[PDB]
Design a protein around this motif. Structure first.
Motif, PDB file in Angstrom:
ATOM      1  N   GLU A  80       0.815  -1.211   0.000  1.00 31.36           N
ATOM      2  CA  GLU A  80       0.000   0.000   0.000  1.00 31.36           C
ATOM      3  C   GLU A  80       0.853   1.268   0.000  1.00 31.36           C
ATOM      4  O   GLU A  80       0.637   2.174  -0.820  1.00 31.36           O
ATOM      5  CB  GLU A  80      -0.970  -0.003   1.180  1.00 31.36           C
ATOM      6  CG  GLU A  80      -1.774   1.284   1.333  1.00 31.36           C
ATOM      7  CD  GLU A  80      -3.065   1.091   2.135  1.00 31.36           C
ATOM      8  OE1 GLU A  80      -3.304  -0.036   2.634  1.00 31.36           O
ATOM      9  OE2 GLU A  80      -3.843   2.067   2.254  1.00 31.36           O
ATOM     10  N   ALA A  81       1.828   1.333   0.902  1.00 34.88           N
ATOM     11  CA  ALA A  81       2.710   2.498   0.956  1.00 34.88           C
ATOM     12  C   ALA A  81       3.398   2.745  -0.383  1.00 34.88           C
ATOM     13  O   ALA A  81       3.458   3.884  -0.875  1.00 34.88           O
ATOM     14  CB  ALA A  81       3.741   2.331   2.055  1.00 34.88           C
ATOM     15  N   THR A  82       3.901   1.665  -0.972  1.00 37.62           N
ATOM     16  CA  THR A  82       4.593   1.734  -2.255  1.00 37.62           C
ATOM     17  C   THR A  82       3.707   2.329  -3.356  1.00 37.62           C
ATOM     18  O   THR A  82       4.101   3.265  -4.074  1.00 37.62           O
ATOM     19  CB  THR A  82       5.091   0.331  -2.674  1.00 37.62           C
ATOM     20  OG1 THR A  82       6.085  -0.105  -1.745  1.00 37.62           O
ATOM     21  CG2 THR A  82       5.698   0.345  -4.083  1.00 37.62           C
ATOM     22  N   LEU A  83       2.499   1.792  -3.468  1.00 34.71           N
ATOM     23  CA  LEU A  83       1.571   2.240  -4.495  1.00 34.71           C
ATOM     24  C   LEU A  83       1.148   3.703  -4.319  1.00 34.71           C
ATOM     25  O   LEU A  83       1.062   4.440  -5.304  1.00 34.71           O
ATOM     26  CB  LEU A  83       0.360   1.304  -4.563  1.00 34.71           C
ATOM     27  CG  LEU A  83       0.660  -0.133  -5.027  1.00 34.71           C
ATOM     28  CD1 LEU A  83      -0.627  -0.915  -5.251  1.00 34.71           C
ATOM     29  CD2 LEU A  83       1.524  -0.155  -6.304  1.00 34.71           C
ATOM     30  N   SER A  96      -6.936  -0.697  -7.622  1.00 32.08           N
ATOM     31  CA  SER A  96      -6.504  -1.733  -6.698  1.00 32.08           C
ATOM     32  C   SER A  96      -6.463  -1.198  -5.256  1.00 32.08           C
ATOM     33  O   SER A  96      -6.712  -1.943  -4.292  1.00 32.08           O
ATOM     34  CB  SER A  96      -5.160  -2.324  -7.118  1.00 32.08           C
ATOM     35  OG  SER A  96      -4.108  -1.428  -6.831  1.00 32.08           O
ATOM     36  N   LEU A  97      -6.193   0.101  -5.110  1.00 28.71           N
ATOM     37  CA  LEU A  97      -6.237   0.713  -3.780  1.00 28.71           C
ATOM     38  C   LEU A  97      -7.657   0.873  -3.224  1.00 28.71           C
ATOM     39  O   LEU A  97      -7.831   0.981  -2.014  1.00 28.71           O
ATOM     40  CB  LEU A  97      -5.492   2.052  -3.738  1.00 28.71           C
ATOM     41  CG  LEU A  97      -3.966   1.952  -3.759  1.00 28.71           C
ATOM     42  CD1 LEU A  97      -3.309   3.329  -3.710  1.00 28.71           C
ATOM     43  CD2 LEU A  97      -3.499   1.069  -2.618  1.00 28.71           C
ATOM     44  N   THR A  98      -8.675   0.905  -4.082  1.00 33.06           N
ATOM     45  CA  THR A  98     -10.038   0.917  -3.540  1.00 33.06           C
ATOM     46  C   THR A  98     -10.358  -0.463  -3.005  1.00 33.06           C
ATOM     47  O   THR A  98     -11.231  -0.619  -2.138  1.00 33.06           O
ATOM     48  CB  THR A  98     -11.127   1.304  -4.556  1.00 33.06           C
ATOM     49  OG1 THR A  98     -11.513   0.154  -5.321  1.00 33.06           O
ATOM     50  CG2 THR A  98     -10.649   2.426  -5.468  1.00 33.06           C
ATOM     51  N   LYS A  99      -9.662  -1.478  -3.512  1.00 32.26           N
ATOM     52  CA  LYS A  99      -9.846  -2.788  -2.861  1.00 32.26           C
ATOM     53  C   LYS A  99      -8.757  -3.224  -1.843  1.00 32.26           C
ATOM     54  O   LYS A  99      -8.469  -4.417  -1.728  1.00 32.26           O
ATOM     55  CB  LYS A  99     -10.020  -3.886  -3.912  1.00 32.26           C
ATOM     56  CG  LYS A  99     -11.038  -3.608  -4.995  1.00 32.26           C
ATOM     57  CD  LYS A  99     -10.816  -4.615  -6.107  1.00 32.26           C
ATOM     58  CE  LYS A  99     -11.761  -4.442  -7.281  1.00 32.26           C
ATOM     59  NZ  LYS A  99     -11.524  -5.530  -8.282  1.00 32.26           N
ATOM     60  N   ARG A 100      -8.161  -2.295  -1.096  1.00 35.57           N
ATOM     61  CA  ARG A 100      -7.002  -2.640  -0.243  1.00 35.57           C
ATOM     62  C   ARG A 100      -7.327  -3.359   1.080  1.00 35.57           C
ATOM     63  O   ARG A 100      -6.426  -3.862   1.771  1.00 35.57           O
ATOM     64  CB  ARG A 100      -6.190  -1.387   0.073  1.00 35.57           C
ATOM     65  CG  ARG A 100      -6.868  -0.501   1.116  1.00 35.57           C
ATOM     66  CD  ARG A 100      -6.484   0.958   0.934  1.00 35.57           C
ATOM     67  NE  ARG A 100      -7.407   1.868   1.609  1.00 35.57           N
ATOM     68  CZ  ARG A 100      -8.529   2.343   1.070  1.00 35.57           C
ATOM     69  NH1 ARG A 100      -8.888   1.996  -0.167  1.00 35.57           N
ATOM     70  NH2 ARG A 100      -9.300   3.166   1.772  1.00 35.57           N
ATOM     71  N   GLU A 119      -9.466  -5.862   1.179  1.00 33.46           N
ATOM     72  CA  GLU A 119      -9.748  -7.238   0.813  1.00 33.46           C
ATOM     73  C   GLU A 119      -8.512  -8.074   1.134  1.00 33.46           C
ATOM     74  O   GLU A 119      -7.383  -7.617   0.993  1.00 33.46           O
ATOM     75  CB  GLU A 119     -10.095  -7.350  -0.674  1.00 33.46           C
ATOM     76  CG  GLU A 119     -11.432  -6.714  -1.093  1.00 33.46           C
ATOM     77  CD  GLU A 119     -11.681  -6.790  -2.617  1.00 33.46           C
ATOM     78  OE1 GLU A 119     -10.755  -7.201  -3.363  1.00 33.46           O
ATOM     79  OE2 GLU A 119     -12.801  -6.438  -3.071  1.00 33.46           O
ATOM     80  N   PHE A 120      -8.735  -9.293   1.596  1.00 34.58           N
ATOM     81  CA  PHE A 120      -7.661 -10.230   1.909  1.00 34.58           C
ATOM     82  C   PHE A 120      -6.712 -10.506   0.717  1.00 34.58           C
ATOM     83  O   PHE A 120      -5.490 -10.584   0.885  1.00 34.58           O
ATOM     84  CB  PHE A 120      -8.314 -11.517   2.410  1.00 34.58           C
ATOM     85  CG  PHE A 120      -7.368 -12.652   2.633  1.00 34.58           C
ATOM     86  CD1 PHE A 120      -6.435 -12.610   3.652  1.00 34.58           C
ATOM     87  CD2 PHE A 120      -7.451 -13.791   1.856  1.00 34.58           C
ATOM     88  CE1 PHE A 120      -5.581 -13.665   3.863  1.00 34.58           C
ATOM     89  CE2 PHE A 120      -6.601 -14.850   2.069  1.00 34.58           C
ATOM     90  CZ  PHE A 120      -5.665 -14.784   3.067  1.00 34.58           C
ATOM     91  N   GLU A 121      -7.274 -10.631  -0.481  1.00 32.70           N
ATOM     92  CA  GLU A 121      -6.485 -10.921  -1.677  1.00 32.70           C
ATOM     93  C   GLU A 121      -5.758  -9.717  -2.292  1.00 32.70           C
ATOM     94  O   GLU A 121      -5.267  -9.798  -3.403  1.00 32.70           O
ATOM     95  CB  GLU A 121      -7.369 -11.601  -2.730  1.00 32.70           C
ATOM     96  CG  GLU A 121      -7.806 -13.029  -2.369  1.00 32.70           C
ATOM     97  CD  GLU A 121      -6.646 -14.046  -2.317  1.00 32.70           C
ATOM     98  OE1 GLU A 121      -6.790 -15.152  -2.897  1.00 32.70           O
ATOM     99  OE2 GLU A 121      -5.599 -13.759  -1.687  1.00 32.70           O
ATOM    100  N   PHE A 122      -5.682  -8.614  -1.557  1.00 31.83           N
ATOM    101  CA  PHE A 122      -5.049  -7.407  -2.056  1.00 31.83           C
ATOM    102  C   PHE A 122      -3.581  -7.596  -2.415  1.00 31.83           C
ATOM    103  O   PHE A 122      -3.114  -7.068  -3.412  1.00 31.83           O
ATOM    104  CB  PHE A 122      -5.191  -6.265  -1.054  1.00 31.83           C
ATOM    105  CG  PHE A 122      -4.349  -5.068  -1.383  1.00 31.83           C
ATOM    106  CD1 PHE A 122      -4.679  -4.244  -2.441  1.00 31.83           C
ATOM    107  CD2 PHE A 122      -3.214  -4.774  -0.642  1.00 31.83           C
ATOM    108  CE1 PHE A 122      -3.895  -3.140  -2.744  1.00 31.83           C
ATOM    109  CE2 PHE A 122      -2.422  -3.682  -0.946  1.00 31.83           C
ATOM    110  CZ  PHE A 122      -2.757  -2.865  -1.990  1.00 31.83           C
ATOM    111  N   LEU A 123      -2.845  -8.332  -1.599  1.00 29.14           N
ATOM    112  CA  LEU A 123      -1.418  -8.460  -1.829  1.00 29.14           C
ATOM    113  C   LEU A 123      -1.183  -9.272  -3.080  1.00 29.14           C
ATOM    114  O   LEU A 123      -0.335  -8.932  -3.915  1.00 29.14           O
ATOM    115  CB  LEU A 123      -0.738  -9.125  -0.639  1.00 29.14           C
ATOM    116  CG  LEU A 123       0.770  -9.267  -0.815  1.00 29.14           C
ATOM    117  CD1 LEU A 123       1.479  -8.731   0.410  1.00 29.14           C
ATOM    118  CD2 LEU A 123       1.145 -10.721  -1.071  1.00 29.14           C
ATOM    119  N   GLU A 124      -1.948 -10.350  -3.197  1.00 25.93           N
ATOM    120  CA  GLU A 124      -1.902 -11.215  -4.363  1.00 25.93           C
ATOM    121  C   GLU A 124      -2.100 -10.405  -5.642  1.00 25.93           C
ATOM    122  O   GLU A 124      -1.276 -10.442  -6.546  1.00 25.93           O
ATOM    123  CB  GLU A 124      -2.981 -12.297  -4.250  1.00 25.93           C
ATOM    124  CG  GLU A 124      -3.089 -13.209  -5.473  1.00 25.93           C
ATOM    125  CD  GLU A 124      -1.898 -14.160  -5.615  1.00 25.93           C
ATOM    126  OE1 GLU A 124      -1.182 -14.372  -4.605  1.00 25.93           O
ATOM    127  OE2 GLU A 124      -1.680 -14.692  -6.735  1.00 25.93           O
TER     128      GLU A 124
END
Lengths: 171, 171
Positions: free
Chosen positions: A10-13, B109-113, B115-120
């Motif tokens: 998140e920080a990176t983005l 992708s940040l609006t979905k941060r 969510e558990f699958e965010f890192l993926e």
């Protein structure tokens, strides 16, 4: 933990977002700069065109001055010649009137000719002898006039040459 | 006899009358002839003036042709340059929109941060890299333009010289 890797991502983005925001502003600034530079190019061009037009207007003023001068020289020549002819016309009127006077004197003595004293009175009239008129040659200065015409043609062809050479500089 | 001397005088004087009548007719015809010669002088003069005016009218046509040509060359340079800038504007718009697109993908992708699958999903976005935009070098040919201006001034002064010489040739 994976919560740490996620907060890291998140920080990176978000840092990326701030950087790209500035780069977009850069591109906006650049678009404006481009249209502006174009308008400046136009203005510069028109300015130069207007300067050219200035020089040509002066060139036309020069041609006009010249033409007026040459025209004056020609009409002066015409004037000189026709004045001489005017003098001549006067001279002819004077001759004609003179002869007409002698004519009337003679006719007079002839009308009162049967008087005895006609011979006494009119023998003096035997004397007077009148001449026919003539017209002096008066010649227009053909060399002056033809010289002007020809030299004006010369001027034109010189000008033509000059223009040719200018445009030649810029193929 | 004196009657004979008198009839003789009469014959003489009448002959004089007829001669003087002819000489007077002569003077009339001469006056007309003089007027004719004057009219011919005038016609010759006006003719020549008209010819002069012809040459000057052609000279002005030449100046106009030249000025039009030079103007065209300047406008061509302007057009070359502003075309390059138009191309550049298009390129810049494309780069801007590209960066803006990546920006919106990231924001997405940040609006979905949470969510558990965010890192993926977003590590691939960690990939993204974008550069700042610039305008390249594009300049108006100042040597060409100033050269045209200067040469046109040259042309003017040459013409001025020529006219001077013509008028000094007819002094």
């Amino acid at each position: 933990s994976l919560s740490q890797a996620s907060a890291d991502l998140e920080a990176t983005l978000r840092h990326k977002l701030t950087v790209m925001y500035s780069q977009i502003n850069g591109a906006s600034r650049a678009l404006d700069d481009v249209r502006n530079r174009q308008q400046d190019v136009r203005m510069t061009a028109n300015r130069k065109v207007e300067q050219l037009q200035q020089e040509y207007t002066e060139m036309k003023a020069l041609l006009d001055a010249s033409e007026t001068t040459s025209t004056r020289k020609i009409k002066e020549e015409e004037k000189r010649v026709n004045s001489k002819f005017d003098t001549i016309y006067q001279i002819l009127l004077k001759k004609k009137s003179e002869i007409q006077t002698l004519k009337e004197e003679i006719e007079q003595s002839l009308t009162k000719r049967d008087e005895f004293e006609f011979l006494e009175k009119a023998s003096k009239l035997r004397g007077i002898s009148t001449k026919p008129v003539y017209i002096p040659e008066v010649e227009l200065n053909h060399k002056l006039i033809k010289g002007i015409h020809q030299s004006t043609i010369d001027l034109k062809n010189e000008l033509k040459q000059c223009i040719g050479r200018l445009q030649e500089l810029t193929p």
